[PDB]
């Protein structure tokens, strides 16, 4: 579980070239900062 730092987006590998809308989480139990994917479309507007 973690705190979201900011909302991002991607420019991923070929052939599927797009902006895929990941986020930045900092975990609680470590202080590590790991990127994270939001599932089913929409739902970036659910997180802040």
């Amino acid at each position: 579980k973690g705190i979201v730092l900011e909302k991002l987006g991607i420019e991923s590998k070929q052939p599927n070239s797009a902006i895929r809308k990941c986020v930045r989480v900092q975990l609680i139990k470590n202080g590590k900062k790991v990127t994270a994917f939001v599932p089913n479309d929409g739902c970036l507007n659910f997180v802040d």
Binding site: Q14, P15, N16, S17, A18
Partner: protein, 264 residues
């Protein structure tokens, strides 16, 4: 005939770069499949190819598997006109052509609204049934533009009054409108004596490098002299040079007698 002014506009953003994408690979890979465009989304490249294949800027080979392309004589044309517009020039084509044999004189609008002359270089104008694609119309006509282009720039740098080349990219040379009238169609002029005194001395100008014009007969230059169709010239190393001397001169010793009545 081979050239076309119609479809230049209707390509989209990626197109010019996608149509460019085959060109960088062309020098190495002269047969370019579809993904070879990608690296250089999943909407982008074929909607360009849908243009490029159906608008004939890229040729298509039909197979069940992914198909290899090799860029088309039509495709460089706009790629040229892309960097053409991007140096700066060629806002629009003009209504006065300008259709020659091997080269296309195009009244063309530079930035500032300058009507000027574009020359597309490719031979044997009609697209021809007998050609192998990718080289003969592109690449032969590609190099040879600069071959001429840097002559006039070198020959205009001499200081003789002649046309100055404006721009060259990808077998397209652009230069001054150079208004005046050729002596091939010459209608009237009163004063030959220094006209031809310039002419016969214009020859030793042409000969100041140890060269001889060989096109100096009629159908070349205009009352500003305005001279054109340079490429045929002969060196001093060129073995037969002395025969061509009286050929050039006397043919323009010939002309005046008929039309404007003068003799040296």
């Amino acid at each position: 005939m081979k050239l076309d002014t119609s479809h230049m506009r209707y390509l989209t953003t990626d197109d010019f770069r996608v149509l460019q994408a085959v060109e960088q690979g062309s020098r190495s890979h002269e047969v370019v499949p579809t993904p070879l465009i990608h690296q250089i989304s999943q909407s982008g490249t074929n909607r360009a190819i849908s243009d490029l294949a159906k608008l004939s800027l890229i040729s298509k080979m039909r197979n069940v598997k992914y198909d290899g392309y090799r860029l088309t004589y039509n495709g460089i044309d706009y790629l040229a006109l892309k960097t053409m517009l991007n140096r700066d020039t060629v806002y629009s084509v003009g209504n006065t052509i300008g259709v020659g044999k091997e080269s296309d004189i195009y009244k063309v609008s530079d930035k500032n609204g300058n009507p000027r002359v574009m020359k597309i270089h490719r031979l044997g104008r009609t697209y021809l049934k007998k050609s192998n694609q990718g080289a003969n119309w592109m690449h032969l006509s590609r190099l040879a533009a600069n071959k001429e282009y840097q002559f006039m720039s070198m020959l205009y740098s001499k200081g003789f009054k002649v046309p100055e080349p404006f721009d060259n990219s990808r077998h397209i040379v652009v230069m001054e409108l150079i208004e005046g009238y050729p002596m091939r169609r010459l209608r009237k002029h009163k004063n030959i004596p220094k006209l031809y005194s310039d002419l016969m001395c214009f020859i030793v100008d042409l000969a100041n490098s140890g060269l001889i014009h060989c096109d100096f007969n009629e159908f070349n230059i205009m009352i500003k002299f305005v001279v054109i169709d340079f490429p045929q010239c002969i060196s001093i190393q060129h073995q037969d040079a002395d025969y061509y001397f009286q050929r050039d001169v006397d043919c323009i010793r010939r002309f005046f007698k008929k039309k404007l009545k003068y003799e040296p």
